[PDB]
Amino acid sequence: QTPDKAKEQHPKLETYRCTKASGCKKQTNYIVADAGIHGIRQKNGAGCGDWGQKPNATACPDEASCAKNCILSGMDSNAYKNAGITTSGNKLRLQQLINNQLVSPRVYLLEENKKKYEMLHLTGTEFSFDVEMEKLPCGMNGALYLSEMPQDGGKSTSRNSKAGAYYGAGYCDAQCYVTPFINGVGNIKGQGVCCNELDIWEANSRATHIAPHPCSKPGLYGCTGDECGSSGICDKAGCGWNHNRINVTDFYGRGKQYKVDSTRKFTVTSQFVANKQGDLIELHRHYIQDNKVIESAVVNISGPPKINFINDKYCAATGANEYMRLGGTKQMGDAMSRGMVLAMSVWWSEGDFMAWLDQGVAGPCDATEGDPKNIVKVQPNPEVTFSNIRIGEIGSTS
Ligand SMILES: OC[C@H]1O[C@@H](S[C@H]2[C@H](O)[C@@H](O)[C@H](S[C@H]3[C@H](O)[C@@H](O)[C@H](S)O[C@@H]3CO)O[C@@H]2CO)[C@H](O)[C@@H](O)[C@@H]1S
Ligand SMILES: *[C@@H]1O[C@H](CO)[C@@H](O)[C@H](O)[C@H]1NC(C)=O
Ligand SMILES: *[C@@H]1O[C@H](CO)[C@@H](O)[C@H](O)[C@H]1NC(C)=O
């Protein structure tokens, strides 16, 4: 789509780069709403296509026509605020609803110039954030994750690609979903938009999940047919780690009866460990609440190695077949070494209610309190605040 002339006022976010020897240093970074949330319309006010579908056929018979007919509205400060996005110092607040409107924001981190996404190379490094999870009941998902999206939003791929990173273009992930735009251009062939993805944090106040999703093609890839499927080029499932699935159900939850108390603020430190050859071999996690290092808990079911981190032995043992088949931890770390885009969102699901995250062996929720219609009864205004993001040498962020 072709950006209109309206001013874009990206919310400011302070983030930190750290070293054992110098500590953490402040950086100016910007937050950008997905291209979609900006508003992509035809002049007659019609839209240019729906998630899961290719673009308007009349507006986008071809790429150039699509580029001309679909206009993207710039988002100013109030636009950002009505989309549920706000920042303060080093805090980012994402609200799920604004004035009874489902806004469910997805935002990406920009470099200080606003023209490129801040690309993060996490293999061999450490990543930490603080999160405020209390206002997230069952069924909700406050996600902090990375996707191997084009740094420029796709702009260099075509003459017609105009939105760029500056307006939130070029999203992808390991689901390979068919979206109306690929790389900032009409997705005329209706391909799935794929790419390696690292889910550092997917949670609500009742359950958390960690999950690397490797893909066999580098960067953003428009899959076709089977390339998009279960045995396709991406690991749709991922190799997850939920303390409730490895039988340690008192590790994370609301209240004093849990090691990490989801009703209060806490720090989430993740450590991506590399071998001598520079390949990712293991993913470590530890928390900080009340000035206390809360170590992750060992596997408490028979099968997996008795460890408290992700590695290929664990993933293999836990039935992460596609993960292992598409290259496992080394493949994921190669995307992490090339550089990935930080994505942050708030969402819920009318289709399965996030059951994979907080029901059965995943958590303490029943089969209906996660329903979006029930979620607003429990918590009328679901939200999440991620803050104090600091990337740096292992041992210096938390
Ligand atoms: O459009 C829906 C919603 O999607 C998330 S993106 C989601 C990715 O698609 C996915 O790769 C993961 S969610 C995924 C878990 O990672 C995986 O372990 C399990 S088994 O399957 C779930 C469900 O697909 O991570 C991201 C982040 O959640 C967007 O963030 C939302 O904005 C939109 S509304
Ligand atoms: C495509 O846009 C045209 C107008 O240009 C509109 O009449 C039609 O409904 C659109 N198709 C869909 C599925 O929305
Ligand atoms: C889960 O752990 C509890 C004790 O911590 C144990 O009693 C139970 O048998 C375990 N479940 C499995 C399947 O191992």
Descriptive key words:
1,4-Beta-D-Glucan Cellobiohydrolase I, Chain A, 8 helices, mainly beta, monomer, hydrolase, binds a molecule of 3 linked components (SSG-SGC-SGC), binds 2-acetamido-2-deoxy-beta-D-glucopyranose, glycoprotein, cellulase activity
Assembly classification: monomer
Helices, by number, come to 8
**Rg estimate, integer Å:** 20 Å
**How many distinct folded domains?**
1
The CATH architecture: Distorted Sandwich
| Approximate strand percentage | 25-35%
PDB class: hydrolase
Keywords: cellulose degradation, hydrolase, glycosidase, glycoprotein
Assembly: monomeric
Entry title: endoglucanase I complexed with non-hydrolysable substrate analogue
Describe the structure.
By secondary structure, the protein is mainly beta. The protein has a single domain, classed as 1,4-Beta-D-Glucan Cellobiohydrolase I, Chain A. Helices cover 13% and strands 32% of the residues. It has helices at 35-38, 63-69, 77-83, 312-317, 321-325, 328-338, 355-358, 372-378, and strands at residues 2-3, 12-19, 23-33, 40-41, 71-72, 85-88, 91-95, 97-98, 101-102, 106-110, 119-120, 126-132, 141-147, 181-182, 185-186, 192-194, 197-204, 207-213, 221-223, 252-253, 260-261, 266-274, 280-289, 292-295, 340-347, 383-392. It has a 15-stranded mixed β-sheet that branches. Strands 1-5-4 form a three-stranded mixed β-sheet. A two-stranded antiparallel sheet has the order 8-9. The radius of gyration is 20 Å and the shape is globular. It binds a molecule of 3 linked components (SSG-SGC-SGC) and 2-acetamido-2-deoxy-beta-D-glucopyranose (2 copies). One 2-acetamido-2-deoxy-beta-D-glucopyranose is lined by residues 247, 300-301. It is classed as hydrolase. The entry lists the keywords cellulose degradation, hydrolase, glycosidase, glycoprotein. It forms a monomeric assembly.
